[PDB]
Amino acid sequence: ADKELKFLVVDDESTMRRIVRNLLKELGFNNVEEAEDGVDALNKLQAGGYGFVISDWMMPNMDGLELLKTIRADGAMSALPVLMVTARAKKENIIAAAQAGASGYVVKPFTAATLEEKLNKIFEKLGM
């Protein structure tokens, strides 16, 4: 994928956003911004320019399932790639997110290899 792709990394834990941003940097992506919840994320997204979202689920203000649904319903954002990266592990959770339009789903804790693999899986699917 284009190394100028602009990422939005969303999680209410600074430590997890830091993991994800440093992983992206290793993969060659430096155009990366952070958001602390679904509302914060939508503000950044409405500001424009974003090509990929990586999002947690459990967050105050607006959770990641609601954030995914909001993105998928919005005509200006509807095809935006959204990778869920979450501790939510039940099959029912994966189903709700997949059916809501998740591009991919990674369960915490995850390895560097898993993130790279699942990001590349989305790039291939979308022809990026």
Q: List contacts with ligand BEF (CB under 6 A).
A: 56-58, 86-88, 108
Residue 50 or residue 57: which is nearer to ligand BEF going by CB?
57
**Residue 36: Cβ-neighbour burial (10 angstroms; 0-12, 13-18, 19+):** middle
Q: Where does this chain touch Mn ion (CB under 5 A) — which range of 51-59, 71-79, 95-103, 116-124?
A: 51-59
The answer to the question of residue 89 lying near Mn ion (CB under 5 A) is: no
- The pair phi, psi for residue 42, each rounded to 5°, is -60, -40
Q: Which stretch binds Mn ion (CB under 5 A): 32-40, 55-63, 105-113, 119-127?
A: 55-63
